Structure 1
Amino acid sequence: AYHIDEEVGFALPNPQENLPDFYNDWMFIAKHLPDLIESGQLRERVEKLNMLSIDHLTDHKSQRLARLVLGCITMAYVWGKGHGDVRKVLPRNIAVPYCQLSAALELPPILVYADCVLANWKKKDPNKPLTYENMDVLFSFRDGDCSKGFFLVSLLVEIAAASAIKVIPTVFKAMQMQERDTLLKALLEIASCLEKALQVFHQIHDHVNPKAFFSVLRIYLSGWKGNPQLSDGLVYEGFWEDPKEFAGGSAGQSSVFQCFDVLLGIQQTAGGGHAAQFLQDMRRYMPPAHRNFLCSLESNPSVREFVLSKGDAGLREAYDACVKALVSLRSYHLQIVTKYILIPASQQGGTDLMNFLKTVRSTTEKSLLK
């Protein structure tokens, strides 16, 4: 209804793995980035490409796949080996069809979370369920970059939150119909589903190691919105005349935390800059059906006001359980950022990044009712 799945939520159900034979030249380069980058040939291959019309991408999953391919080539081309030797101009034969496909999908021409997590996965055996050991990513950047661990655990955290988003309708039917036990059961189910997502987030440490992420994988996830290396943005040759700035693909582009902010009345959604607006800016990097889900959610009556006006220590307790699960997620997430960003940057905090994350948690903490 809003491109949300029952089993995988904001994730794309069974992504396409193949593009039509017309696009083999893209697929070949995208599937061999680790070789081509290491050998210092990637840029030469990109420049030798021909302009390939997007006209033969006629279904959504194949356009999704084509954006993942083009997004990964774009990251590799711009940054190269990550040795500070950057390219400031995306060649015309890639930039035009990429920008055209991105306009059709209503996404910025940069690699986003919906590309490299939500659409970048396959089941090893389809008859066996969605667990790490039975899944693989579709593209990677450098050997030992831990893209498989980072992407798949993100996805598995995404899939765990999915089992909460399917209760969200029932929360609202229950409020409407003055249905006290249902609403209390429903909020409990959400809190327990947010709790299972926190368990799943623990799998990060045995599939990603801090140095691979911080010094290899992070390079190719970096964008050009306020980045000293491309002080002015990127030139999408033959599509726009002046450079453009787009944010690098943080997992901050996930809709999961915002979905439950909006549902719980937590005013991250609104507020003061350097915080509420970064979360608003980050909405522009999410698929359009998902942008709409978040907006429709706000239009709904407040759950926090409903629960507040009922003198019901039961409803207040279940609502607080959901608030408390959210606070744990961001707290654990603060741990994750320390190990995978701060200590490695510290070994050759110092960035307000932590004040952003901490601010967001404190807001979540101050929404507790009782």
Structure 2
Amino acid sequence: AAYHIDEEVGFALPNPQENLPDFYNDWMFIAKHLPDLIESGQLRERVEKLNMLSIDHLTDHKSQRLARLVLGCITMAYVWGKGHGDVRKVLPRNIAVPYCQLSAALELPPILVYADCVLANWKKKDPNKPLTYENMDVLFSFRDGDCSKGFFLVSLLVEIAAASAIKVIPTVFKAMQMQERDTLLKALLEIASCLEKALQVFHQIHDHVNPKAFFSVLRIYLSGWKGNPQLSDGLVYEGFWEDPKEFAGGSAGQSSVFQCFDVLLGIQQTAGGGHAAQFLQDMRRYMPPAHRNFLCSLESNPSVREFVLSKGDAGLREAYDACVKALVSLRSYHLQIVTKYILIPASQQAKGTGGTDLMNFLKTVRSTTEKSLLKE
């Protein structure tokens, strides 16, 4: 509510803006034509010829969100080029400066993130039909046959499915705060079901995303410069920071959906000095700031886990366990997705060298989720 959470679409930006003020057309034209401009070897040339446009004409939140998307898309294309190794280590001043300033205003790092290319990058084809794949579209793509429509929309359609679980979270805390045993139990059962529906939405990834396309084309435009050998020291945001800075690649791992129900269930992923807790805390740096606050204010609330154990209630424990189980399913299925779209295409013809780091990260987080089951 005050954490920029929509009841219909959750962490997704409701009805995002598609057009920037005519003042920014030179940006909009480049971003809308990245498939051709990258194809024809012209993208870097047009970026380097841009003037510097003041960000003072981005008048409202949704317009700044759209412009972060345009500039984020232009940056990725510029840095990565055609994605065959010939990279760019200096983002020109005429983009670097307005982008860094706009990102500082929005409290996001100056790199493309999930909130840009999934949460803000969509529209209904017909605004009176409902939110289904057939009635939506993304607003930007990088290459012909990069399956960005399928990967962004389905990631987004999962976000929407999670929203029906998220709009219950107040009812859970109100239930506790008033000792409403049955209200609490139905809320948790409802959350578990919504999360089970989310898992079903996740299945549509196979209909709309080709593994070779993802691993070989879309994964390139989504890669950052933070522990990247190709940009060992980060990117120079010319005219804004004297020294190159390092920013993580925009993944789905930036989604607030898994952490939101980790925090709500008292599952302590982001607890410790371990490497998995770190990456999860890091990824919060890459989320919209209203959602960064939502997660922290959830950790500050009285624990669901502690209350269900305090009551000697098989009922609440089953329902709380139903949610914990749903989370384990999502991560299990999510591990099966990672194997299809990254693990297998890697071992042909690129983190987790041989599999080691990627898989063991996601396995670790799933295991922490497993051990949280109350059972008894």
TM-score normalised according to structure 2 size: 0.98
Deviations 1:334-359 (A, max 9, x none): 00000000000011243311000000
The unaligned stretches of length 5 or more in structure 2 are: none
Distance in 1, matches of 2:315 and 2:43, equals 60
Distance in 1, matches of 2:121 and 2:251, equals 15
Q: Which residue of 2 aligns with 1:23?
A: 24
The unaligned stretches of length 5 or more in structure 1 are: none
Q: CA RMSD in A?
A: 0.5
Matched, 1:221 2:226: no
Distance in 1, matches of 2:181 and 2:78, equals 56
Contact 1:261 1:269 in 2 (8 A): no
Contact 2:270 2:276 in 1 (8 A): no
Contact 1:125 1:134 in 2 (8 A): yes
The CA deviation at 1:273 is 2.2
Matched, 1:184 2:185: yes
Deviations 1:128-153 (A, max 9, x none): 00000000000000000000000000
Contact 1:146 1:212 in 2 (8 A): yes
Distance in 2, matches of 1:350 and 1:193, equals 31
| Identical positions, percent | 100
Distance in 2, matches of 1:309 and 1:181, equals 15
Secondary structure of 1:275's match? helix
TM-score normalised according to structure 1 size: 0.99
Contact 1:79 1:219 in 2 (8 A): yes
Deviations 1:17-60 (A, max 9, x none): 00011010000000000000000000000000000000000100
Contact 1:64 1:115 in 2 (8 A): yes
The CA deviation at 1:220 is 0.2
Q: Which residue of 1 aligns with 2:361?
A: 356
Distance in 2, matches of 1:65 and 1:79, equals 21
Q: Equivalent of 1:367, from 348, 365, 372?
A: 372
Deviations 1:64-89 (A, max 9, x none): 00000000000000000011000000
Contact 2:266 2:305 in 1 (8 A): yes
The CA deviation at 1:281 is 0.3
Secondary structure of 1:350's match? helix
Q: Which residue of 1 aligns with 2:155?
A: 154
Distance in 2, matches of 1:327 and 1:153, equals 20
Distance in 1, matches of 2:331 and 2:292, equals 21
Deviations 1:105-139 (A, max 9, x none): 00000000000000000000001000000000000
Contact 1:331 1:361 in 2 (8 A): yes
- Paired residues in the alignment total 370
Distance in 1, matches of 2:168 and 2:365, equals 24
Contact 1:37 1:142 in 2 (8 A): yes
Distance in 2, matches of 1:158 and 1:107, equals 20
Contact 1:52 1:93 in 2 (8 A): yes
Contact 2:226 2:234 in 1 (8 A): yes
Distance in 2, matches of 1:285 and 1:309, equals 36
Matched, 1:33 2:34: yes
Secondary structure of 1:117's match? helix
Q: Which residue of 2 aligns with 1:259?
A: 260
Contact 1:71 1:109 in 2 (8 A): yes
Q: Which residue of 2 aligns with 1:310?
A: 311
Secondary structure of 1:351's match? helix
The CA deviation at 1:270 is 1.0
Distance in 1, matches of 2:182 and 2:123, equals 39
The CA deviation at 1:269 is 2.5
Distance in 1, matches of 2:273 and 2:102, equals 34
Deviations 1:195-228 (A, max 9, x none): 0000000000010010000000000000000000
The CA deviation at 1:272 is 3.0
The CA deviation at 1:274 is 1.2
Distance in 2, matches of 1:347 and 1:227, equals 21
Contact 1:235 1:243 in 2 (8 A): yes
Distance in 1, matches of 2:192 and 2:324, equals 8
Distance in 2, matches of 1:19 and 1:186, equals 41
Secondary structure of 1:4's match? coil
Distance in 1, matches of 2:233 and 2:275, equals 20
Distance in 1, matches of 2:12 and 2:100, equals 23
Contact 1:137 1:152 in 2 (8 A): yes
Distance in 2, matches of 1:332 and 1:306, equals 29
Distance in 1, matches of 2:304 and 2:355, equals 38
Q: Which residue of 2 aligns with 1:2?
A: 3
Secondary structure of 2:234's match? coil
Deviations 1:239-267 (A, max 9, x none): 00000000000100000000000000001
Contact 1:253 1:282 in 2 (8 A): yes
Q: Which residue of 1 aligns with 2:335?
A: 334
Contact 1:2 1:292 in 2 (8 A): yes
Contact 1:70 1:98 in 2 (8 A): yes
Runs of 4+ with >4 A deviation: none
